[PDB]
Design a protein around this ligand. Structure first.
Ligand code: ALF
Ligand code: MG
Length: 873
């Protein structure tokens, strides 16, 4: 009992592996008990130290074929009625008195209690029972960004449309508007000042805080650009108005109060649209939590002659060492060993396939599995976080948190732009000061400011500052923000129209970078439902008659292969109605015997035996060499096969297997032609995976891959610097989908897989994945083009604003500033909208492009990898 040791085990891929390890270790003398988990690869062994040593245990585990290495409970409760300190003190004293409890404290302010103890000796149930006996009850314990950007945009609009309208009205012709309340100001100037001040105070607040955050990050983005430009323009306008007032100037100076409202308007709109597009809801965690069983039926004493009472207890409160009865159709509450129970379990959560798995005494079960075929009793071994489903939840959380935001190309452009605009503005200022100082005739000729009585130096300085600030205002791109959001929304709409649901804007901008794609085998590449592939005849009755007789015999069978056979027979036959007279008898996993005396019904449209080789061997029916070879070939192909005999005579054989999707081969070929790697990762048997890869022409095959191993492969491929797209439709694929750079979920897949994936194929056609790439390409290029439209119109303005074309007679006009934004925004919006004309490439185009290049692959060329370390053949 004492000196229990901890071990780390690697190379283990099956629950049967865990059962074998536990059985072998317990068989050896000295070892008292052994515990191990599947995905965690952690084990705990209790043994007598004086008989065996941890090194011997590690050597024994290694001999089993799994690498072994030697390496080195808190409960929170709320208790009602904790209104007195005496009760808390008494509870604490009673807790310390009981053995196995290390510490226990209770807070009177919030009635919360924390207890630290050894799980092997004490559990939450004991503490709860003690508290109840004492006399008290105890029980165990982005939109903001959108809202703020929307508020900024709305304020900027409300207080910027009026000023823009006033500017347009002035541009069209207005005498009263130029009238001066005081010698310096004018009505228009005062209204502009008030409106710009209101917009800056209200609309720009979030701009200012975001810019401050960006500077704290040692980076300059669009927010910093807008804040700098608008603040400079507003400060200069206020300063010139103030000096005009002080000097009682006859004419009010030109002001740039127009610019800040305009830029705030459009940039806030762009940011708001970007945040709307980026928003997504991930509920995979909620679905996984829903998978786990809510409660368990704890059984006191044992399953042996003494069975005193049963209780219903929350799975959270369940502790190791308690026998729990799971009824048919009920979820397995905790991982454990089956005792005195035999049934079937669905392990699609881990292994991923729908084939039921037998459970017998000495076997192991996984939490969250669906039981059937009868009741079972389970002795718990892992509970709570230690459960496999909890480990999958942890992996999904880690994958989701690992993902980092992708920097917007707008921010990257602004990072260069801000120094560029600063440099050009300073250059314009200094060169104009120099020109004014050296000659001063150019200033007289090209500006009326010389008419002012101020000194020449003041004239040149004011002209240089005005020109520099005009250049600064013109340089700012108003449509920069909208370029990416508009294209992202249009691409998402196009994808939705074409049958692809894209959550967020990241997949559209990332799919083009994909160079490696991993495909799940079941569902994703092949239809999940098993289907009959080939029927052979082993005195010479028609095949259809035998098929009808089997379907009548197999009508009541609940085996998935049974329903597959029955549906195949019904499809082959008229299947107007099944025979009324039929007697059925089934032995679990052995064979089925039926009596059918309604062959007349089949003819209008006397015994049946369905079994495997073992059934024939025990019944005494010999197996011919040719049929044996055929069955061996079918087993090599990985497809299941069963035999039908009538009146004790072998009659026929039926084979059932999954059917590869029609477009799987074409999709794989297209991906390979485009230069993208294709990998088949699955949890099924190696033979079936190899056969499916041969059919779909995938060179790299991974078999018996646990959910954690899929994430490990994703991480390795990403560490190779490649971008990975994971296509899955099961729970085991959800952590890989979350971790993968791109996650594609088949429309018919599980809810968790759909939630985790960023792209969902509503049409459940594999070729859409290729389209999901092509469309993404058509998007990204467009975005780049939009950015050109966002800058070119403003950029061409900069030479004019700086006076480059002034001697030619071209000078900046007030209408040019507004025209630049109008043209840029219109061009960006129209370019983004043009993506709606995108047409999905036809499947016929794919087939023609691969009409001759496509070729079947030999089975030998394909290499199958079993597990992460590939220890097994
Ligand atoms: F359907 Al799988 F791994 F084979 F998710
Ligand atoms: Mg699947």
């Amino acid at each position: 009992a004492p000196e229990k040791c901890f071990l780390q085990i690697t190379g283990m891929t099956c629950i049967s592996c865990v059962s074998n390890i536990e059985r072998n270790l317990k068989k050896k003398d000295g070892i008292v008990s052994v515990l191990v988990a599947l995905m965690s690869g952690k084990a705990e062994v209790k043994f007598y130290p004086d008989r065996i040593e941890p090194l011997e245990i590690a050597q024994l585990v290694e001999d089993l074929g799994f690498g072994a290495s030697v390496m080195e409970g808190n409960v929170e409760l709320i208790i009602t009625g904790m209104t007195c300190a005496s009760c808390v003190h008494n509870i604490e004293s009673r807790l310390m008195r009981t053995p196995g409890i290390l510490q226990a404290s209770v807070a009177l302010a919030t009635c919360k209690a924390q207890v630290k103890f050894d799980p092997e000796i004490v559990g939450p149930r004991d503490i709860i029972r003690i508290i109840e006996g004492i006399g008290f009850q105890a029980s165990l314990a982005h939109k903001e960004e959108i809202k703020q950007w929307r508020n900024s945009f709305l304020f900027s609009l409300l207080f910027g449309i009026p000023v823009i309208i006033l500017m347009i009205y002035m541009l069209a012709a207005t005498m009263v508007l130029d009238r001066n309340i005081v010698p310096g100001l004018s009505i228009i100037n005062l209204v502009f000042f008030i409106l710009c001040t209101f917009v800056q105070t209200l609309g720009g607040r979030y701009f200012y805080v975001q810019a401050y955050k960006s500077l704290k990050h040692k980076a300059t983005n669009m927010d910093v650009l807008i804040v700098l430009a608008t603040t400079i323009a507003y400060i200069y306008s206020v300063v010139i108005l103030t000096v005009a007032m002080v000097e009682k100037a006859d004419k009010s100076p030109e002001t740039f109060f127009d610019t800040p409202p305009m830029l705030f308007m459009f940039i806030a709109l762009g940011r708001w649209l970007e945040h709307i597009a980026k928003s997504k809801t991930s509920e995979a965690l909620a679905k996984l939590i829903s998978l786990q069983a809510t409660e368990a039926a704890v059984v006191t004493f044992g399953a042996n002659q003494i069975i005193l009472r049963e209780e219903q207890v929350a799975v959270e409160l369940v502790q190791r060492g308690d026998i729990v009865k799971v009824v048919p159709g009920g979820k397995f509450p905790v991982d454990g060993k089956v005792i005195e129970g035999t049934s079937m379990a669905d392990e699609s959560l881990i292994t991923g396939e729908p084939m039921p798995v037998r459970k017998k005494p000495g076997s192991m079960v996984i939490a969250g599995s669906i039981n059937a075929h009868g009741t079972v009793l389970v002795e718990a071994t892992h509970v709570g976080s230690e459960t496999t489903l909890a480990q999958i939840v942890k992996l999904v959380e880690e994958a989701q948190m690992s993902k980092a935001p992708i920097q917007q190309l707008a921010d990257k452009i602004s990072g260069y732009f801000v120094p560029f605009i600063i440099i050009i503005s300073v250059v314009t200022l200094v060169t104009w000061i120099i020109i004014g100082f050296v000659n001063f005739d150019i200033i007289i000729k090209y500006f009326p400011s010389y008419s002012k009585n101020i000194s020449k130096t003041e004239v040149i300085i004011r002209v240089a500052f005005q020109t520099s600030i005009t250049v600064l205002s013109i340089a700012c791109p108003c449509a920069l923000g909208l370029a990416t959001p508009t294209a992202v929304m249009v691409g998402t709409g196009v994808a939705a129209q074409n049958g692809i649901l894209i959550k967020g804007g990241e997949p559209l901008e990332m799919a083009h970078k994909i160079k490696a794609v991993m495909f799940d085998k079941t569902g994703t590449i092949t239809h999940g439902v098993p289907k009959v592939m080939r029927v052979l005849l082993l005195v010479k009755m028609p095949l259809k008659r035998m098929l009808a007789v089997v379907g009548t015999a197999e009508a009541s069978s609940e085996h998935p292969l049974g329903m597959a056979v029955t549906k195949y027979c019904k499809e082959e036959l008229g299947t107007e109605l099944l025979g009324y007279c039929t007697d059925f008898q089934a032995v679990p996993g052995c064979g089925i015997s039926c009596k059918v005396n309604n062959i007349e019904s089949v003819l209008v449209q006397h015994t049946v035996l369905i079994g495997n080789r073992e059934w024939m061997r025990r019944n005494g029916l010999h197996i011919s060499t040719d049929v044996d070879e055929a069955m061996s070939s079918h087993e090599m192909k990985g497809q299941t096969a069963v035999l039908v005999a009538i009146d004790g005579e072998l009659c026929g054989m039926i084979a059932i297997a999954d059917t590869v999707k029609q477009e799987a081969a074409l999709a794989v070929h297209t991906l390979k032609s485009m230069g993208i790697d294709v990998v088949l990762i699955t949890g099924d048997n190696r033979k079936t995976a190899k056969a499916i890869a041969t059919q779909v022409g995938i060179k790299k095959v991974f078999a018996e891959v646990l959910p954690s191993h899929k994430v490990a492969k994703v991480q390795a491929l990403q560490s190779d610097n490649k971008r990975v797209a994971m296509v899955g439709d099961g729970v085991n694929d959800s952590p890989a989908l979350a971790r993968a750079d791109v996650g594609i979920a088949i429309g018919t897949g599980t809810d968790v897989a759909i939630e985790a994936a960023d792209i969902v194929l509503i049409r459940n056609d594999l070729l859409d994945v290729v389209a999901s790439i092509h469309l993404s390409k058509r998007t990204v290029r467009r975005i780049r083009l939009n950015f050109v439209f966002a800058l070119i119109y403003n950029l061409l303005g900069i030479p004019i604003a700086a006076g480059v074309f002034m001697p030619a007679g071209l000078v900046l006009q007030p209408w040019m500033g507004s025209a630049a934004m109008a043209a840029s925004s219109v061009s960006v919006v129209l370019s983004s909208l043009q993506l709606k004309c995108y047409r999905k490439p036809d499947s016929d185009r794919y087939e023609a492009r691969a009409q001759g290049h496509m070729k079947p692959l030999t089975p030998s060329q394909i290499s199958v990898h079993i597990g992460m370390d590939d220890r097994w053949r």
